[PDB]
Coordinates of C-alpha atoms and ligand atoms in Angstrom, one line a residue:
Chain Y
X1 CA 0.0 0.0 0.0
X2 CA 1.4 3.3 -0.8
X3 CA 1.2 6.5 1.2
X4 CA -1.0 8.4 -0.2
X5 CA -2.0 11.9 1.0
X6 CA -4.9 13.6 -1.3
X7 CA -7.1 16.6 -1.7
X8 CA -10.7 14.3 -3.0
X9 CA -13.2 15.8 -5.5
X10 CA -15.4 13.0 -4.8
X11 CA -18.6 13.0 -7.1
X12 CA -20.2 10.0 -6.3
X13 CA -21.8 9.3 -2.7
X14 CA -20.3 6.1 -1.6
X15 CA -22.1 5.3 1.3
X16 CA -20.3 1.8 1.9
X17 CA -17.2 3.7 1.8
X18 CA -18.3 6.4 4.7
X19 CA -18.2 8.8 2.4
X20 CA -21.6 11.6 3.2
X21 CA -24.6 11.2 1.2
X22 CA -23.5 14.1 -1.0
X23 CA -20.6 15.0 -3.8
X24 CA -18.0 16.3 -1.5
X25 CA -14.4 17.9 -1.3
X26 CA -12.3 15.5 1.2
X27 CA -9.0 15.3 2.7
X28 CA -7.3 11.9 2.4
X29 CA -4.5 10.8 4.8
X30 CA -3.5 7.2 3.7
X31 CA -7.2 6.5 3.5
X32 CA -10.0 6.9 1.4
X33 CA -12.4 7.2 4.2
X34 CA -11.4 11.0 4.2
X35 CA -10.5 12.8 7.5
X36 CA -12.8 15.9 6.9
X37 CA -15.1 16.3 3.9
X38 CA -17.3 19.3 3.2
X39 CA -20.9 19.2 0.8
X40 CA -19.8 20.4 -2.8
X41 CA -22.8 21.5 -5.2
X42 CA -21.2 19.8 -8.1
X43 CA -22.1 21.7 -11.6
X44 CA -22.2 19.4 -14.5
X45 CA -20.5 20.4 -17.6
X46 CA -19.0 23.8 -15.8
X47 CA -15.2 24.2 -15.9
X48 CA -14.3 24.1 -11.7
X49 CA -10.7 25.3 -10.1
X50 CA -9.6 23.5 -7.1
X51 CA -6.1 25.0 -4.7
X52 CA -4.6 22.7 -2.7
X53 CA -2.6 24.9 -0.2
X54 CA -0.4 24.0 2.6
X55 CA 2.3 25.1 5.3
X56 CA 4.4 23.6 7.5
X57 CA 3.9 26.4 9.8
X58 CA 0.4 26.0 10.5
X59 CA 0.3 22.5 9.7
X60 CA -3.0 22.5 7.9
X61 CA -3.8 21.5 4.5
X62 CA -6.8 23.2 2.7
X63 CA -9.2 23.0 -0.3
X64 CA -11.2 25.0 -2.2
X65 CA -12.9 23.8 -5.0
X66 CA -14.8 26.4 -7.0
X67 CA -17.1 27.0 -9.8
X68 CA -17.5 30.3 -12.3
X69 CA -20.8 31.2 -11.0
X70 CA -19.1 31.7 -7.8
X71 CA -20.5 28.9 -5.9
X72 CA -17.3 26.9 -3.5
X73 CA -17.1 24.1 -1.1
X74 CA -13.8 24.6 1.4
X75 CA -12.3 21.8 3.7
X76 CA -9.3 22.0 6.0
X77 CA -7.7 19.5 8.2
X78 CA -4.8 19.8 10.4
X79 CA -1.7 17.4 10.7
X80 CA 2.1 17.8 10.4
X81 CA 2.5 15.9 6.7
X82 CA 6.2 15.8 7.3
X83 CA 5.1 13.1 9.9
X84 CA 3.1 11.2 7.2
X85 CA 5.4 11.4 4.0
X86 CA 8.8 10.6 3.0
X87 CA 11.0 13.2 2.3
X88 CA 11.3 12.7 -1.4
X89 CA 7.5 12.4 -3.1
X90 CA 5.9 12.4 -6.7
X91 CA 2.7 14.9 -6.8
X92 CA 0.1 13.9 -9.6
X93 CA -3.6 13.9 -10.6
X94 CA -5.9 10.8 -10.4
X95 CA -9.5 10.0 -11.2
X96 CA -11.6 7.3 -12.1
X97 CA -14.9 6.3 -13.6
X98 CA -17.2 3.2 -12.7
X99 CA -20.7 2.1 -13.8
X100 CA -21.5 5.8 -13.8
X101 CA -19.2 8.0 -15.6
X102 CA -17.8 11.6 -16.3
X103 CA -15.2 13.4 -18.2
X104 CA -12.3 13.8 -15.7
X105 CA -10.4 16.6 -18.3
X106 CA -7.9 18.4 -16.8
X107 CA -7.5 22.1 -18.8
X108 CA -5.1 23.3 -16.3
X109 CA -2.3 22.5 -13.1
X110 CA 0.2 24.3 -11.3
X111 CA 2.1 23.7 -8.4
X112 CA 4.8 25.0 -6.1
X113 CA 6.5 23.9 -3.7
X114 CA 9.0 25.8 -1.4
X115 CA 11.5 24.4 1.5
X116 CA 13.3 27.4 3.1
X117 CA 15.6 26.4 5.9
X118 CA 17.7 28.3 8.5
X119 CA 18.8 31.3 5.9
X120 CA 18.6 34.8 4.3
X121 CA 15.4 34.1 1.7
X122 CA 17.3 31.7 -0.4
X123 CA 15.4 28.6 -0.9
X124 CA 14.7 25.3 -2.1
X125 CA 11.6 25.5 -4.9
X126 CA 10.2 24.1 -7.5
X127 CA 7.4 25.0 -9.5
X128 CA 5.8 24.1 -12.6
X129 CA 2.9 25.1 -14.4
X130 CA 0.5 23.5 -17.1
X131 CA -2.0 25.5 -19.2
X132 CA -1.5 22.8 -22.3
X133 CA -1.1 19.4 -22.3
X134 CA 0.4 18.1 -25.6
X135 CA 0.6 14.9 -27.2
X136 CA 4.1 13.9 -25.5
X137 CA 4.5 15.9 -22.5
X138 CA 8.0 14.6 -21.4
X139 CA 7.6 15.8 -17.8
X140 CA 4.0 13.7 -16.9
X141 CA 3.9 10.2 -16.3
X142 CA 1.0 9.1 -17.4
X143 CA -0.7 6.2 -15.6
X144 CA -3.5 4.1 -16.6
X145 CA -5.9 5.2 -19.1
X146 CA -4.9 9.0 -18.6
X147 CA -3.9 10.9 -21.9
X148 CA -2.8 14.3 -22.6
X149 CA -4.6 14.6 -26.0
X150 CA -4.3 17.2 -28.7
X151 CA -7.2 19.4 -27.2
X152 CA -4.4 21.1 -24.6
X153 CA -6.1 18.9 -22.1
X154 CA -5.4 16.1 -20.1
X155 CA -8.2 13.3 -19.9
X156 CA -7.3 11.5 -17.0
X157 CA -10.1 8.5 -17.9
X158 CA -11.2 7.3 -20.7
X159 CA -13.4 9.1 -22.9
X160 CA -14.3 8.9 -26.9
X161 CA -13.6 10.7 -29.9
X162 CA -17.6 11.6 -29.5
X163 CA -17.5 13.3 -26.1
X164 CA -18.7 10.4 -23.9
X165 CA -17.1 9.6 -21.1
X166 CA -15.6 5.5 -20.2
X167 CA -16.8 3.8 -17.5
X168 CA -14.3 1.3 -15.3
X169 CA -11.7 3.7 -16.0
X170 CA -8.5 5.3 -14.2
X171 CA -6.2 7.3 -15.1
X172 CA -3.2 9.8 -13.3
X173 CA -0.7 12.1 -14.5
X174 CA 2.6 12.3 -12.2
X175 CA 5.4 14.8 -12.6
X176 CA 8.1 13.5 -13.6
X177 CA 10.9 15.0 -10.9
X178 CA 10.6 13.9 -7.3
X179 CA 9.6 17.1 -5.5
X180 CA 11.8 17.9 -2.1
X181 CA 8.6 18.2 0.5
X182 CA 10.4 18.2 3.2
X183 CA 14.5 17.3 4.9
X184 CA 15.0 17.2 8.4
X185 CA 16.0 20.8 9.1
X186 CA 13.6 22.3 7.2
X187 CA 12.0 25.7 9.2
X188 CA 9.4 25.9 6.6
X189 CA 8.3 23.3 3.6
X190 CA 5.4 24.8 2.0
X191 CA 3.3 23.9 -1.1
X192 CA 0.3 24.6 -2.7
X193 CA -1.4 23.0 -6.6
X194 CA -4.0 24.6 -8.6
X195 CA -5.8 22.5 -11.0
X196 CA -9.2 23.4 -13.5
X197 CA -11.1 20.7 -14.4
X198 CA -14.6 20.2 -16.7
X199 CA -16.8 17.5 -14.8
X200 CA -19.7 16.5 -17.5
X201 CA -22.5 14.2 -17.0
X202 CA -25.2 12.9 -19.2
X203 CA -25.9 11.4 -16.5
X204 CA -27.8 11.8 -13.2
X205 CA -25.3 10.2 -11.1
X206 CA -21.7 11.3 -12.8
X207 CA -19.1 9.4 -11.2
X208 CA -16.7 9.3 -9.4
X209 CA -13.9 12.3 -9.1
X210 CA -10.8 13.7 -9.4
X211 CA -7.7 14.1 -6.8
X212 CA -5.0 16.3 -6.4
X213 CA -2.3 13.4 -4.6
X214 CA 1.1 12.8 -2.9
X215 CA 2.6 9.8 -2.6
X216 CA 6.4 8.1 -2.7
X217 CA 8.1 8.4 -5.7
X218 CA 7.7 5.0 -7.4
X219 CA 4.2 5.4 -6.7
X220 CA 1.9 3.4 -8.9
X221 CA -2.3 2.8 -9.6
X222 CA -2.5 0.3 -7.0
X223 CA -5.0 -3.0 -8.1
X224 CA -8.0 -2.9 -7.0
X225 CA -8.4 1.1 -7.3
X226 CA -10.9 2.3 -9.3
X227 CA -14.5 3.7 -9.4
X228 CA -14.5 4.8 -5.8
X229 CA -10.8 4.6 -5.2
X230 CA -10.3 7.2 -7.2
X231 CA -7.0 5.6 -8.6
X232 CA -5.4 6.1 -5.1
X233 CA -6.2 3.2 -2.7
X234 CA -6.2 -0.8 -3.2
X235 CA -9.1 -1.1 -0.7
X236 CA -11.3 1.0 1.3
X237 CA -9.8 0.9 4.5
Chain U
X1 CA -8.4 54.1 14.7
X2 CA -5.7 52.6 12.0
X3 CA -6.7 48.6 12.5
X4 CA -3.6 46.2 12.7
X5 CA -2.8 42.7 12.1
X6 CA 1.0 42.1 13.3
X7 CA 3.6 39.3 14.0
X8 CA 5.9 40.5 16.7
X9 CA 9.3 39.8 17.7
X10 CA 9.4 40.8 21.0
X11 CA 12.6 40.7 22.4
X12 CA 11.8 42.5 25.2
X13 CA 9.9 40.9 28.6
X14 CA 6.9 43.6 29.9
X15 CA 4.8 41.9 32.7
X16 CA 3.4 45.7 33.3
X17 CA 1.2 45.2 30.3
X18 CA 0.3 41.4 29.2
X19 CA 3.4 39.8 27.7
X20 CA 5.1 36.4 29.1
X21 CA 8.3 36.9 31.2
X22 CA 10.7 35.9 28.3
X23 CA 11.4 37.2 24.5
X24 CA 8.6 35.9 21.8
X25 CA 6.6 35.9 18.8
X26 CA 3.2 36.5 19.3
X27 CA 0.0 37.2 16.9
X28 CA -1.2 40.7 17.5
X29 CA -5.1 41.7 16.7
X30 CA -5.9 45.1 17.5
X31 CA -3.6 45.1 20.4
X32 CA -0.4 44.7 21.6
X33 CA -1.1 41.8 23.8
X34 CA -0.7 38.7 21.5
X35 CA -3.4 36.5 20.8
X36 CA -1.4 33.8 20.8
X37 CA 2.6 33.7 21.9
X38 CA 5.6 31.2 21.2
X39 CA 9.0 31.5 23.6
X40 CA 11.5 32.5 21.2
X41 CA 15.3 33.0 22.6
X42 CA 16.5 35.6 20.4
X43 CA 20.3 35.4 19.5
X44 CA 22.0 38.8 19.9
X45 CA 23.9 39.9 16.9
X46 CA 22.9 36.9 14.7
X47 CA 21.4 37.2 11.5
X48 CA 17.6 36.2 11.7
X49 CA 14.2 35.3 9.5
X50 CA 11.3 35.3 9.9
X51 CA 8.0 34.0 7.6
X52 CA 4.5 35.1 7.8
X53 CA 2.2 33.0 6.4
X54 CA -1.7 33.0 5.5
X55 CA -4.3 31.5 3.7
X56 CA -8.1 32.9 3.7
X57 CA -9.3 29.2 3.2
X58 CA -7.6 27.3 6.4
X59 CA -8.0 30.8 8.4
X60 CA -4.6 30.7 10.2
X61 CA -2.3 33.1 10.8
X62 CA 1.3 31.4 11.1
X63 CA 4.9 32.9 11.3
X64 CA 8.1 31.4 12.4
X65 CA 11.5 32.9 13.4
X66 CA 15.0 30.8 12.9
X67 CA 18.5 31.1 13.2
X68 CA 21.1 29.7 10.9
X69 CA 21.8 27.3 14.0
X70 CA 18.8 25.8 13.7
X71 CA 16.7 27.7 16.3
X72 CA 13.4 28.6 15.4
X73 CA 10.5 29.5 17.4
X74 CA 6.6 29.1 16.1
X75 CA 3.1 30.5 16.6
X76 CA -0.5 30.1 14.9
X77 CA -3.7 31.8 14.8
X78 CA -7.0 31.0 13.6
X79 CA -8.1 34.1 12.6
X80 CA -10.0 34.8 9.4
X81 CA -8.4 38.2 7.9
X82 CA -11.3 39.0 5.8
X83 CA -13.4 39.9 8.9
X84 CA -10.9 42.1 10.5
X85 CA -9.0 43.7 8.1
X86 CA -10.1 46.3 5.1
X87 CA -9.9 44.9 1.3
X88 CA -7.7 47.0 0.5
X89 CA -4.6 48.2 3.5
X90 CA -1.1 48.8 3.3
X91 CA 1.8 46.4 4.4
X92 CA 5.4 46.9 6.4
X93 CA 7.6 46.9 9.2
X94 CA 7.6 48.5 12.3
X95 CA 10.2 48.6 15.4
X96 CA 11.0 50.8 18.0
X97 CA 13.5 51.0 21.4
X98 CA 13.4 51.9 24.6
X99 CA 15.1 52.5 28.2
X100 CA 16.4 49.2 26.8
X101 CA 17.5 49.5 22.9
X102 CA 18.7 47.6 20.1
X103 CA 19.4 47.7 16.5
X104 CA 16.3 47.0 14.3
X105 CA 17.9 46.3 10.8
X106 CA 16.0 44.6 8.1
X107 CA 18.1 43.1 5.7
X108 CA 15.7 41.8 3.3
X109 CA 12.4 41.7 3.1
X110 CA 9.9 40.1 0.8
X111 CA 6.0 40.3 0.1
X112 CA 3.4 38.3 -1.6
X113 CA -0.5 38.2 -1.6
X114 CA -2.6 36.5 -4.4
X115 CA -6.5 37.1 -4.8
X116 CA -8.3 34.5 -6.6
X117 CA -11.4 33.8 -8.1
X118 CA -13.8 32.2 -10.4
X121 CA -7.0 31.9 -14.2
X122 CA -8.2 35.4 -13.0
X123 CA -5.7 35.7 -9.8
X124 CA -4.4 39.6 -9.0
X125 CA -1.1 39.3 -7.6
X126 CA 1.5 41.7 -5.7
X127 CA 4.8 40.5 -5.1
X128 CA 8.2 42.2 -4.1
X129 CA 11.7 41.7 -2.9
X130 CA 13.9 43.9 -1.3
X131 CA 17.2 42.4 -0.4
X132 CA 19.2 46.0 -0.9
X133 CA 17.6 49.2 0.4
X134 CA 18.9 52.4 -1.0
X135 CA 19.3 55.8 0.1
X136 CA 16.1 56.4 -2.3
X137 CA 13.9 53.4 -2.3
X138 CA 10.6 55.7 -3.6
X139 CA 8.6 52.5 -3.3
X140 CA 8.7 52.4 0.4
X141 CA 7.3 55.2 2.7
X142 CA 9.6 55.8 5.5
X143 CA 7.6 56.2 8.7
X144 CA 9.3 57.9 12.2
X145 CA 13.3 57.0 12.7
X146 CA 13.3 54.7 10.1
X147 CA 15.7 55.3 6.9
X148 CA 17.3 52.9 4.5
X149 CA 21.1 53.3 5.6
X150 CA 24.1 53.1 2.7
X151 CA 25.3 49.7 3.9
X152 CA 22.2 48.3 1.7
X153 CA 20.0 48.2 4.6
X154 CA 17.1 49.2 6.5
X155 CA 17.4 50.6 9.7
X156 CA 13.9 51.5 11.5
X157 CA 15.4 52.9 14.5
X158 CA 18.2 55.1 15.1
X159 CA 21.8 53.8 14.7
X160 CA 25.0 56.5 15.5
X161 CA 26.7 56.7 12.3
X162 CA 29.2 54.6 14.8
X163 CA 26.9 51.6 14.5
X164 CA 25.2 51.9 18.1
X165 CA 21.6 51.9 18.4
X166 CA 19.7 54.8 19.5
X167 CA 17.4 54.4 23.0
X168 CA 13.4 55.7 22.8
X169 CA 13.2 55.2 19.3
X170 CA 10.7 54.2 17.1
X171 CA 10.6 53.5 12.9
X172 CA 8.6 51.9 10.4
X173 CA 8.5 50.9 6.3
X174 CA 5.1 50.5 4.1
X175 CA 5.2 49.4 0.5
X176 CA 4.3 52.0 -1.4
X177 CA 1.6 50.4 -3.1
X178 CA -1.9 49.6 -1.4
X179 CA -2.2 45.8 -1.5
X180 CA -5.4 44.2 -2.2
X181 CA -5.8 41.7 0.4
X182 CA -8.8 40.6 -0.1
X183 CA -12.2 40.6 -1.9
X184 CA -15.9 40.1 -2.6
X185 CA -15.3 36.9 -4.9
X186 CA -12.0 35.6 -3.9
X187 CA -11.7 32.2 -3.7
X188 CA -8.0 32.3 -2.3
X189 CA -6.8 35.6 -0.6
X190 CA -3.2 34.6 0.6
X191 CA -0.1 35.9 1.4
X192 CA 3.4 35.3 3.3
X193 CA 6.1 37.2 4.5
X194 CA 9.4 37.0 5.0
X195 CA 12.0 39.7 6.4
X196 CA 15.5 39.5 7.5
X197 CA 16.8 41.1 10.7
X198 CA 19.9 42.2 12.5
X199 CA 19.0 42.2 16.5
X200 CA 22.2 43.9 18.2
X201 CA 22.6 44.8 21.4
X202 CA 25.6 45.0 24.2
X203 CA 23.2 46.1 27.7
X204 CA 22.3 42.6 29.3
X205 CA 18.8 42.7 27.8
X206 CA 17.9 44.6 24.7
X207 CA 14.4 45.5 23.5
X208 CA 11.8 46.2 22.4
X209 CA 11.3 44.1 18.9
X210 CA 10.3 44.4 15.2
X211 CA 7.1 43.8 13.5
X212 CA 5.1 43.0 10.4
X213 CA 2.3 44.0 10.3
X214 CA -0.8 45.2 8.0
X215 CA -3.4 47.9 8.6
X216 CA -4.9 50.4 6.3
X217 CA -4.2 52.2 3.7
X218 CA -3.2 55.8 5.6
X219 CA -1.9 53.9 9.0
X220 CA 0.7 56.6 10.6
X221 CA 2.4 55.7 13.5
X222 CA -0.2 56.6 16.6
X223 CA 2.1 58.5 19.1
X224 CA 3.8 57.4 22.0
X225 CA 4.0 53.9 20.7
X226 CA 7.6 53.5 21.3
X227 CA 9.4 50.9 23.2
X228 CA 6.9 48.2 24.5
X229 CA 3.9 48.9 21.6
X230 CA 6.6 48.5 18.9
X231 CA 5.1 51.9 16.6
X232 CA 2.0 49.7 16.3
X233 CA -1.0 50.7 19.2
X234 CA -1.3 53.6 20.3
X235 CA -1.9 52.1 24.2
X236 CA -1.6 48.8 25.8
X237 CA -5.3 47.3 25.6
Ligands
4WM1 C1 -4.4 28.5 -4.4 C2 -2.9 28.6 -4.3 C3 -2.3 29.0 -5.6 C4 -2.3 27.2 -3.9 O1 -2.6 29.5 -3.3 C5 -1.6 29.1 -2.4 O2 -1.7 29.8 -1.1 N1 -0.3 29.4 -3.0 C6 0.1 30.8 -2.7 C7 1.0 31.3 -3.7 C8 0.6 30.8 -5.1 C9 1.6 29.8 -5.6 O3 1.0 29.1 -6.8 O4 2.8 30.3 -6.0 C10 0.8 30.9 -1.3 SE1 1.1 29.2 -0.7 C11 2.8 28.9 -0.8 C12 3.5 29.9 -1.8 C13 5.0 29.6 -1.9 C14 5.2 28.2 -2.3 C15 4.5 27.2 -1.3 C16 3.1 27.5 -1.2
4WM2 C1 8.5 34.2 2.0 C2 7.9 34.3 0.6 C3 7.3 35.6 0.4 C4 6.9 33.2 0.3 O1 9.0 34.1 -0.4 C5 8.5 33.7 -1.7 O2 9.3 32.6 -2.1 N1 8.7 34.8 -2.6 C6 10.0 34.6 -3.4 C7 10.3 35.9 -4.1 C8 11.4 35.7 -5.1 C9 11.4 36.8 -6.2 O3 12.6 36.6 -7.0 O4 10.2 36.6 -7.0 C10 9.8 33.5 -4.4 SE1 8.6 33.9 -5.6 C11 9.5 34.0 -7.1 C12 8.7 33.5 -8.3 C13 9.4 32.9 -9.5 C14 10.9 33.4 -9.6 C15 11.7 33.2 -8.3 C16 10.8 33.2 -7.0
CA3 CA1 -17.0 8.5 -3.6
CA4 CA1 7.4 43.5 24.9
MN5 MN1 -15.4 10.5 -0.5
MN6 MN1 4.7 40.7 23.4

């Protein structure tokens, strides 16, 4: 099992899975049974943005996810990651599709992060930002059924030349440099991942969702994970 | 008056008002007395950092001081920023001496603060690692000036390199930061400044801030020493 830490957009309401009776925003901690969820008013077919952001500082990781109308769903959750991840870490996106299905596209993801140690502003970052994905984009490992088409966007599941969206799909996309999260004498490790994403449903009951993750470095789609594992976790505990 | 949102580093002990009975970092609301306060053993004559951090999503106010030995001290707030603080104020640093005194010198000091939305995101950052004898992006506040050995000195030194006593000094950017608003998403920011804290008497005082407040915040008077050029009083 590998560690997985993850920011959830969760569209379908698992209820086997504890998962609220409602789409929801969650926060993962080696689990998919989140450790704090909030009610999101999914909007089919709408083009969302979801910030991961977190500090060492504070020790709390946050989510906003966020549609142009200017509806949002928020969920925080405190915990000093640095306890719960290995130095050295691969960041990536995953979703999945199951009986019910949804385009997971991906138009757009950023991400910093920043470890400044005992010294005069000079520090450890790294940042990268995607606004198009193209055909061979050297610096993604793609997982599973996840492609980074010709649109500019990256389709994490399955989906046809028609617009329709595959079922019993998953698919991430990994950067392809380990990212430095953390090191033991690190005064501040900070990060923080944008992400836009179009969500459509024909329909009633699109599932499942897309995640924002972080997890070791040879990280792979576990068996097992998909529909309601959102590409992240073998099993449901 | 002039609402303020600060992160202190008091280096200077007063029991007469509200403080612990050792140098710290504390989260200031509206008043000197810290809503929250971390022991922090400041290291005389050692170059210092400091990092302010927030994020209008998680609602925490965090900042932590180190020391190139290591040493760093740590304090958080919950504290939602939107609620207490104007859309639109102005950022900087304050400091100020006493009976007991010390040299305040920022070496550098940095700035950001994104708004977001529903990739429409306003953004201000800035850097300042060399101040100048004519940095006309920063308004100069009390004793503070921007000394010819590339920093920023926001109380009195003698042209010796001794601090002054009963001073007080403070830098603003120049421009008004937009720190938050009606549909932002994400209304962060995080700051960093480094300090010089000198002194040779036993226990030096009284400490430097950052801090934010609005847009025309002067220095209220008699904040020297213990208030830091901050509050006007001690409540
Ligand atoms: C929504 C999101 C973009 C994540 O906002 C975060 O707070 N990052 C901001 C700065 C934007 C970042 O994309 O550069 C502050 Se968080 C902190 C910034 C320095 C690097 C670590 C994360
Ligand atoms: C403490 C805090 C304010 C978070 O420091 C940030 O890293 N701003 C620095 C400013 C560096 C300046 O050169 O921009 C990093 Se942001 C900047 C963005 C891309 C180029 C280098 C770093
Ligand atoms: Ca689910
Ligand atoms: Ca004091
Ligand atoms: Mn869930
Ligand atoms: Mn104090």
């Amino acid at each position: 099992a590998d560690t997985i830490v993850a920011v959830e957009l969760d569209t379908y309401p698992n209820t086997d899975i504890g998962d609220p009776s409602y789409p929801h925003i969650g926060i993962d901690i080696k689990s998919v049974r989140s450790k704090k969820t909030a009610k999101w008013n999914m909007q089919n077919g709408k083009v969302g943005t979801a910030h991961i952001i977190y500090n060492s500082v504070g020790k709390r990781l946050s989510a906003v996810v966020s549609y142009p109308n200017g509806d949002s769903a928020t969920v925080s959750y405190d915990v000093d990651l640095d306890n719960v991840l290995p130095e050295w870490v691969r960041v990536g996106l995953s979703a999945s599709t199951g009986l019910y299905k949804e385009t997971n596209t991906i138009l757009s993801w950023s991400f910093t992060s920043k470890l400044k140690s005992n010294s005069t502003h000079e520090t450890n970052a790294l940042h990268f930002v995607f606004n198009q994905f193209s055909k061979d984009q050297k610096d993604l490992i793609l997982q599973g059924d996840a492609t980074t088409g010709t649109d500019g966007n990256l389709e994490l599941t399955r989906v046809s030349s028609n617009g329709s969206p595959q079922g019993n799909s998953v698919g991430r996309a990994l950067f392809y440099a380990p990212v430095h999260i953390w090191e033991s004498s690190a005064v501040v490790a900070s990060f923080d991942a944008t992400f836009t994403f179009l969500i459509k449903s024909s329909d009633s009951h699109p599932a499942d969702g897309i995640a924002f993750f972080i997890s070791n470095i040879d990280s792979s789609i576990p068996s097992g994970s998909t529909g309601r594992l959102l590409g992240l976790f073998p099993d449901a505990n």
